[PDB]
Symmetry: C3
Subunit: 136 residues, 3 copies
């Protein structure tokens, strides 16, 4: 009963890995050898890009599964895919120019804030169903 959620989660974790590869690729192109995190405009953008995806990734996974379990698996899955796409736009946009990230960032944050809300409703909804009412 969590098969779709699990599918989205492994994709999402591939996008994360693939983002991390791109950063390792930039350390070669722009000659930023560890433990450096600065030394090229081009590199600083690609680095901070994924860093942003890393710091939001746990938030997304929690909200995805909580909406997924407690409200509707299929809707959460779809919003999940939208988020994946939002972060593709974020990363590649940011990589080009800092200013070109916002479209990516706004839709990712949208979908997140939405999953949060659907999760919270679904949890509240089930909190009544372990007290009396199951709203239909």
């Amino acid at each position: 009963n969590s098969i779709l959620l699990a599918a989205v989660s492994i994709l999402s974790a591939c996008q994360q890995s693939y983002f991390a590869l791109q950063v390792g690729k930039a350390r070669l192109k722009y000659k930023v050898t560890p433990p450096a995190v600065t030394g090229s405009p081009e590199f600083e953008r690609v680095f901070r890009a994924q860093q942003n995806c890393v710091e939001f990734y746990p938030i997304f996974i929690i909200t995805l599964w909580m909406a997924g379990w407690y409200f509707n698996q299929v809707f959460a899955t779809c919003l999940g895919l939208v988020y994946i796409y939002g972060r593709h736009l974020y990363f590649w946009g940011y990589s080009e120019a800092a200013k070109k990230r916002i479209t990516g960032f706004r839709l990712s944050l949208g979908i997140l804030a939405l999953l949060t809300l659907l999760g919270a409703l679904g949890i509240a909804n089930s909190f009544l169903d372990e007290y009396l009412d199951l709203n239909i």
Copy 2:
């Protein structure tokens, strides 16, 4: 079903995370630090490093919360969960003001975490015996 309290704490915790991230985005405006910069003001560097610290501990906390939650007791884990959330509000806002004023916040969250870890470990160990050689001390 069995995890409604854990799920509640988790959504709240993930809001604190988002709310912290908003505050940093707000400081990039106040202290005029445009991406991809992470430095250029003492005030901004503290607010940035603050949540960065919460980001790097957040997965640790979620694992330990659910593992204590499932394998020991949902209700105790939930409450300790709330304590941690509060501890990190003290950490972030303390740090934001002065570096030195973060410690009370940090030592709390660390306390609660290290506790969740232990309750999780007992509960997992406890169930590992009761799937192989019985572990239940229920005498009185």
Copy 3:
């Protein structure tokens, strides 16, 4: 039954905590007072080391549980242990010299990429039966 997955997960989270302690220890040895993240080669290596484990940790936990549930708990558990060990080699190798992180990194990344695939199979496998 997810008892073995839960066991690995708590250990992995202890390694994470322990790595974070080591960085806090380096802020004392190399006198890097917050909010600084630079000012010693020795400190920058120990800092970037854990940062790297933090940014992979959620990836690992998802892939661990997805391979664990959807394919086989016991195989995933073992690969789990391997990853833990791989990251001990990564962190401590990096801490000494940047160059001596690679064996740690290649194996951690190997096991991850493997768990990913075992997870993907196991999900696909169950998608055919529903």
